[PDB]
Design a binder for this molecule. Structure first.
Ligand SMILES: [Zn+2]
Ligand SMILES: [Zn+2]
Lengths: 253, 253
């Protein structure tokens, strides 16, 4: 459905660079790994190159290449992200931490040679030095979420929203409301989609031989949101021939 | 801290067999992959060898080898699972699905030759044909949970409990309360731990090539629950030198 699409048919190398400033605490993070959009799979490891991260690693999970989403055959028309490639897209976000500060981010994602590269600037303000973020009170894990996408034809792109729950130690949760826009860098045609979502799931781990402050991130990302026997609830592929299916339903009578 | 411990030093291949019966619906699943206790990493793929699974895959996540948990060095005394290897342990569970039925499971985990093998029998009763489980209303994802472990000296074993949240489509959650016991199979000495937890995280995926009904499972499991500048909340290793640490604290004066 786009020239972009064809660029993701194999494993693609990824590089990430973030510059951050949260409540004046400056830091930088570099990441590398690879992505496999046929599977919907990101494999990344990030390292804080300025020392220790002044925020919990899990608050940067969302910031740390949605072009690696698996879009099934029947929805490839709705894949804005690859359709912008190679010239790429800019991702903007504001992220509001309930009862705390906010991050604003701007990312440039595009191919640099054969590598997909995300260069990000992040600013955080109004955080509580004793709150869950600057206080490092967040657990080192993550939950599944759905990323809701819609077209923003006015800006030739998409608008995206979702809410993240970050588990806290005492068993509380810290809410992070994400408001996102993506616009193409280049001026070729892009794919503008019907409303749908990315099911995303995230596993965070540690490289037992890495002494630097670091996060290993696995992500699995599959698009959805664009078949069941009414008698016995048996499940069939959504492509499953309609008359074969009804023949199964008739079996109940 | 045990001989078992040394068996988990490398990548270990894993096989899984389950025989299941839920509300009279019988089924079998076979699984394989590998485990790396040094990272706390399980990699598994499962196939329903009888046809279609009459329950959702995510309801079998907890059932589908806790001997692969990474126990930090300072806690290797509390690692019951490896300590019962190679002879192994039996894991029993009752799993209560709120407003629905329950699974009861019994599993044998041990080495067979060089492979770690888990053979499981599962029985489910009192399920609603219309409810979240037999109606296949559960989303295909997973959240992080902490697995609370305690010694059960009377049984020369451990007792474990945790509560799983399964996301539903409409944004509801289905609760699954797990009550677990593990007892060694052999009669060598085992390690009986102080209370602690395993932080577990799971990512569920599909193999695009595989047309059988199946689940790809990644897990990252690390033990905890057995050091922070009181001024700026800067983080230090739990074993970081106490005088170096206080030297940093004194920096603020
Ligand atoms: Zn039927
Ligand atoms: Zn300090």
């Amino acid at each position: 459905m786009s020239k972009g699409e064809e660029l993701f048919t194999g494993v693609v190398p990824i590089l990430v660079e973030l510059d951050g400033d949260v409540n004046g605490h400056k830091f930088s993070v570099s990441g590398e790994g690879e992505g496999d959009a046929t599977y919907g799979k990101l494999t990344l490891k990030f390292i804080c190159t300025t020392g220790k991260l002044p925020v919990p690693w899990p608050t940067l999970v969302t910031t740390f290449v949605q072009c690696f989403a698996r879009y099934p055959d029947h929805m490839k028309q709705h894949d804005f992200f690859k359709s912008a490639m190679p010239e790429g897209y800019v991702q903007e976000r504001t992220i509001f931490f309930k009862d705390d500060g906010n991050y604003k981010t701007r990312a440039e994602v595009k191919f640099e040679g054969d590598t997909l590269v995300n260069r990000i600037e992040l600013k955080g303000i109004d955080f509580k030095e004793d709150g869950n973020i600057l206080g490092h009170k967040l657990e080192y894990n993550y939950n599944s979420h759905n990323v809701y996408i819609m077209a923003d034809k006015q800006k030739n792109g998409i608008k995206v929203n979702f809410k993240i729950r970050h588990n806290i130690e005492d068993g509380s949760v810290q809410l992070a409301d994400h408001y996102q826009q993506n616009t193409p860098i280049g001026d070729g045609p892009v794919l503008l989609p019907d409303n749908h979502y990315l099911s995303t799931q995230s596993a965070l781990s540690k490289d037992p031989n890495e002494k630097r402050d670091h996060m290993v991130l696995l992500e699995f990302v599959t698009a959805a949101g664009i078949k069941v026997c009414p008698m016995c609830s048996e499940q069939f592929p959504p492509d499953y021939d309609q008359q074969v299916f009804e023949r199964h339903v008739q079996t109940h009578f």
